[PDB]
Amino acid sequence: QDYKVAEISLADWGRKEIAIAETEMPGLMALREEFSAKKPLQGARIAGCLHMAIATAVLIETLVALGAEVRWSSCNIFSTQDHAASAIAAKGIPVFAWKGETEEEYWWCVEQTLSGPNGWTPNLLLDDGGDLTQVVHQKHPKLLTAIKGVSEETTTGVARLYEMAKHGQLKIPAINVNNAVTKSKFDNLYGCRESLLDGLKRATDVMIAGKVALILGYGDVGKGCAQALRGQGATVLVAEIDPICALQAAMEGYRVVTLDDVAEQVDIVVTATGNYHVVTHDHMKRMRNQAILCNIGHFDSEIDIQSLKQYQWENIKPQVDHVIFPDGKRIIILAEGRLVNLGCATGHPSFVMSASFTNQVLAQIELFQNSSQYQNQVYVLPKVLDEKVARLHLGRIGAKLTQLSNEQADYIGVDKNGPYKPDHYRY
Amino acid sequence: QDYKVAEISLADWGRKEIAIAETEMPGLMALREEFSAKKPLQGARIAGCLHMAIATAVLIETLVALGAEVRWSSCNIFSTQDHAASAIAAKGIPVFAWKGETEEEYWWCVEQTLSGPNGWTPNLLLDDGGDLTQVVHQKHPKLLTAIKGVSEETTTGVARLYEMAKHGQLKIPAINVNNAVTKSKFDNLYGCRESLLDGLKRATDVMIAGKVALILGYGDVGKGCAQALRGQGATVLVAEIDPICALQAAMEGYRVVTLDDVAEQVDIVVTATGNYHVVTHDHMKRMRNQAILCNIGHFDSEIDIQSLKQYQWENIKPQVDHVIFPDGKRIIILAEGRLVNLGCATGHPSFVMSASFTNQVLAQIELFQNSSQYQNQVYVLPKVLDEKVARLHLGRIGAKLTQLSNEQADYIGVDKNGPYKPDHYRY
Numbered sequence: 107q108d109y110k111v112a113e114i115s116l117a118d119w120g121r122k123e124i125a126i127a128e129t130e131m132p133g134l135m136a137l138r139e140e141f142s143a144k145k146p147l148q149g150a151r152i153a154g155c156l157h158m159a160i161a162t163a164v165l166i167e168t169l170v171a172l173g174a175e176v177r178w179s180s181c182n183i184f185s186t187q188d189h190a191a192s193a194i195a196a197k198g199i200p201v202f203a204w205k206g207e208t209e210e211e212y213w214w215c216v217e218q219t220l221s222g223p224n225g226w227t228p229n230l231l232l233d234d235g236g237d238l239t240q241v242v243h244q245k246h247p248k249l250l251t252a253i254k255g256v257s258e259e260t261t262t263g264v265a266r267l268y269e270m271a272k273h274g275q276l277k278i279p280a281i282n283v284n285n286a287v288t289k290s291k292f293d294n295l296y297g298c299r300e301s302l303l304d305g306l307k308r309a310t311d312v313m314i315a316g317k318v319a320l321i322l323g324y325g326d327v328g329k330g331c332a333q334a335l336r337g338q339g340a341t342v343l344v345a346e347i348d349p350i351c352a353l354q355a356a357m358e359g360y361r362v363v364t365l366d367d368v369a370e371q372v373d374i375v376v377t378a379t380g381n382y383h384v385v386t387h388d389h390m391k392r393m394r395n396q397a398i399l400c401n402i403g404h405f406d407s408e409i410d411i412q413s414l415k416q417y418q419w420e421n422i423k424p425q426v427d428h429v430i431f432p433d434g435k436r437i438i439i440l441a442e443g444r445l446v447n448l449g450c451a452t453g454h455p456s457f458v459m460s461a462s463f464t465n466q467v468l469a470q471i472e473l474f475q476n477s478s479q480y481q482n483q484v485y486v487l488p489k490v491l492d493e494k495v496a497r498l499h500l501g502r503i504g505a506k507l508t509q510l511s512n513e514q515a516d517y518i519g520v521d522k523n524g525p526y527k528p529d530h531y532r533y
Numbered sequence: 534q535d536y537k538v539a540e541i542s543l544a545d546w547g548r549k550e551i552a553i554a555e556t557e558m559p560g561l562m563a564l565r566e567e568f569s570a571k572k573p574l575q576g577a578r579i580a581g582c583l584h585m586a587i588a589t590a591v592l593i594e595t596l597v598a599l600g601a602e603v604r605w606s607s608c609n610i611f612s613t614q615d616h617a618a619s620a621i622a623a624k625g626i627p628v629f630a631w632k633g634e635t636e637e638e639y640w641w642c643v644e645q646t647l648s649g650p651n652g653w654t655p656n657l658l659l660d661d662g663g664d665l666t667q668v669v670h671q672k673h674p675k676l677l678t679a680i681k682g683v684s685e686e687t688t689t690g691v692a693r694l695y696e697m698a699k700h701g702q703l704k705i706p707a708i709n710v711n712n713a714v715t716k717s718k719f720d721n722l723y724g725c726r727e728s729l730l731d732g733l734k735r736a737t738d739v740m741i742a743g744k745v746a747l748i749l750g751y752g753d754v755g756k757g758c759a760q761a762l763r764g765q766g767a768t769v770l771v772a773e774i775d776p777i778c779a780l781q782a783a784m785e786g787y788r789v790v791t792l793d794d795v796a797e798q799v800d801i802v803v804t805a806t807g808n809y810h811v812v813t814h815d816h817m818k819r820m821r822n823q824a825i826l827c828n829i830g831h832f833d834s835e836i837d838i839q840s841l842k843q844y845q846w847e848n849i850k851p852q853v854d855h856v857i858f859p860d861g862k863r864i865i866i867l868a869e870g871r872l873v874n875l876g877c878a879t880g881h882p883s884f885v886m887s888a889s890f891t892n893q894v895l896a897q898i899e900l901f902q903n904s905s906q907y908q909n910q911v912y913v914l915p916k917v918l919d920e921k922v923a924r925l926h927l928g929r930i931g932a933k934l935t936q937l938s939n940e941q942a943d944y945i946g947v948d949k950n951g952p953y954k955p956d957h958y959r960y
């Protein structure tokens with residue numbers, strides 16, 4: 107049994123939702139249909155470190171259907187869906203994940219992905235947030251020798267790739283999947299538009315209409331979060347350090363404020379900064395009784411939970427806790443400040459994960475077949491692959507593409523079949 | 534009298550709205566405040582070809598307050614605001630613009646900007662759409678010798694710069710102002726979100742709620758147009774050739790369709806493609822009686838108005854015409870298919886033009902002082918200037934910026950004062 111799940115009996119349930127999820131994930135099904143014969147990933151050995159969810163079970167079974175060998179692990183202690191993990195393990199796939207890991211179990215699960223029976227080594231890393239990349243770079247430099255590349259899923263993991271490259275610490279080729287237009291401008295934005303609401307709802311059942319909600323950060327995650335809340339009738343406030351994102355938020359009608367100023371006025375706070383200690387002890391002490399505080403950025407770092415260890419915690423239900431201040435005023439904290447959408451719900455729905463994961467598979471086929479051509483820097487996929495990803499998803503939602511005539515193509519300077527935009531088009 | 538306006542008497546009216554517009558344009562007022570002493574543009578001679586509107590009168594008076602010499606002209610035969618043009622001419626500034634130019638008058642107005650009394654030559658070009666750039670490149674190559682650079686305002690003019698560079702025809706340095714984040718993602722999007730409605734309303738007074746509206750194109754102009762219509766209760770349809778933009782539109786809830794399929798179903802059509810003949814004769818013949826057809830892309834090319842010259846035209850009021858088909862069915866065409874927002878209204882409001890025009894002034898200070906450093910290619914302004922532009926506009930709309938601490942700045946790898954994003958961040 108080369109697996110470690112919480113409950114292997116949930117496999118049938120997991121399989122049932124995986125079947126459903128395949129009808130929601132046309133990108134991966136289409137990648138199956140195209141590459142299942144050739145098996146471009148035959149000989150690949152992939153250490154996965156990405157939320158072990160049902161959508162991820164489809165990505166895994168798609169890499170397998172393309173010939174690859176994998177070992178998986180979640181990148182968050184609360185993000186694994188157990189029946190998904192169970193259905194993967196039942197298929198003979200090594201997976202180490204369960205909802206509710208301790209920090210020690212988490213890093214052991216990561217360690218499990220790096221070695222398998224009969225000297226199984228990875229030549230591929232598939233990493234969401236940089237933890238698997240840092241473990242191999244700092245604790246198995248003997249592993250980095252056989253690694254063709256890493257494909258990083260999220261903004262925070264990409265920033266960590268950059269500081270590595272900046273101090274000559276990045277020692278393998280790295281594909282920024284996060285910055286595929288069909289990841290960043292879709293997953294981070296439209297997915298969080300749906301799963302933040304989900305997380306808040308499952309955790310607290312709080313009415314959104316009429317509440318004052320503060321989004322710290324107006325990147326693609328913040329942009330989607332704010333849409334979510336404003337659509338349910340919340341007054342949305344936005345904090346920003348970047349004047350350009352601040353202006354976008356202002357011009358969508360949000361008031362741009364600082365937490366220093368508004369900590370007493372907010373009913374809900376969502377941290378989406380990817381930064382450190384943007385919610386402090388003084389902020390939480392100033393917050394009103396039963397204020398809901400949650401983090402949708404990648405790391406818990408965003409709130410200073412250390413500053414709440416003095417106080418007494420009363421658990422409400424799993425991943426929903428009260429912190430009681432000395433004056434008896436209570437704060438509701440979701441998932442102890444880890445990813446609220448995956449921690450208190452099920453993350454992004456499968457359809458938008460399909461665009462992200464089609465980008466991941468493509469980057470694995472590409473890292474596995476042409477890694478020689480890449481140095482120890484970060485790169486993004488070509489635009490024509492980005493367009494192919496989007497093209498594979500138009501059918502599911504019934505969007506019909508117009509076809510350029512020869513002269514229209516010449517008129518705007520493009521080939522009929524794309525690419526349709528200059529490299530730095532922002533969409 | 535080195536000017537040619539329709540009516541010099543409108544100067545006082547123009548001046549009154551210019552004064553108002555200054556309180557809406559903090560970017561240019563702030564640029565005045567910073568650079569009015571030094572006058573970084575002393576010695577500059579700028580041929581302007583950009584919609585002669587009230588906002589543009591502020592940009593012009595700002596370049597003047599920074600020391601420059603200018604001659605102006607609109608880039609559209611219907612876009613000049615006459616009282617704005619009148620107030621500029623009254624200030625002793627040469628301007629050749631009026632609402633209702635013929636094509637011959639238009640190109641003569643452009644020609645006027647290239648020479649002034651006592652051998653006045655331009656060393657600077659400020660061009661919105663490429664017409665001034667093409668005139669100088671193809672009909673005054675003796676002028677190109679003294680030209681430091683051109684700053685291009687719009688997507689279509691940038692595409693024309695690119696085909697020039699691709700065939701070695703671009704012979705001066707060129708600054709893509711359109712692709713400053715604080716132009717493209719603001720002017721094209723939030724401005725058209727407001728002035729398309731304006732144009733349709735002033736021209737026809739048609740109810741938007743309940744109407745089926747088709748946007749051809751889902752770039753930044755199309756994205757804003759669709760927001761505009763959906764917010765007034767229209768059913769919005771979208772056409773696209775780019776699968777990525779098609780997917781964005783689908784995921785905002787628009788149906789993505791082709792005009793070939795839906796020509797009989799639409800009450801309003803807005804062309805926003807920057808392309809050629811996207812509305813054909815067969816489309817217009819299939820359209821319902823009193824269908825409203827308008828173009829918000831840069832050039833009339835988008836509709837095949839030639840194919841309507843057979844038919845009888847009945848004028849409704851200025852820039853609002855009927856085309857009568859042989860079966861007596863009538864189409865409403867705005868501004869004979871030229872820019873509907875500037876042709877049937879007043880273009881974008883001054884505030885968003887201030888962000889665009891602050892980018893223009895910056896690019897003129899930069900082209901005028903460091904043109905040696907640039908070749909005969911297209912370039913964009915540095916991110917730190919983009920951020921400065923946004924920063925100058927936060928105060929007007931009361932957005933308060935959060936300040937990074939030293940450790941937060943290190944945590945995400947940026948300087949406290951910016952730039953805050955990697956170069957290819959898409960916002």
Ligand SMILES: NC(=O)c1ccc[n+]([C@@H]2O[C@H](COP(=O)([O-])OP(=O)(O)OC[C@H]3O[C@@H](n4cnc5c(N)ncnc54)[C@H](O)[C@@H]3O)[C@@H](O)[C@H]2O)c1
Nearest residue numbers: 260261262323325326327345346347348379380381403404
């Ligand atoms: N929950 C999810 O499913 C999900 C999905 C994608 C990314 N993420 C994570 O969310 C975080 C943000 O993602 P993103 O893609 O929006 O990145 P982003 O860079 O686009 O957005 C971050 C924004 O926060 C702002 N910010 C940074 N520090 C701040 C501070 N102290 N105060 C106010 N604003 C501040 C930045 O200026 C930036 O605009 C990342 O850590 C990313 O890994 C989560």
Ligand SMILES: NC(=O)c1ccc[n+]([C@@H]2O[C@H](COP(=O)([O-])OP(=O)(O)OC[C@H]3O[C@@H](n4cnc5c(N)ncnc54)[C@H](O)[C@@H]3O)[C@@H](O)[C@H]2O)c1
Nearest residue numbers: 687688689750752753754772773774775806807808830831
């Ligand atoms: N009215 C204004 O105030 C204003 C402001 C900015 C730009 N513009 C003009 O509007 C035009 C578009 O501007 P933009 O910034 O949105 O450019 P853009 O490139 O972002 O958008 C153009 C979109 O139209 C799509 N398209 C092209 N041909 C098509 C076809 N045959 N069918 C369907 N879709 C098609 C493209 O795929 C693209 O997504 C440009 O000509 C620009 O100069 C006008």
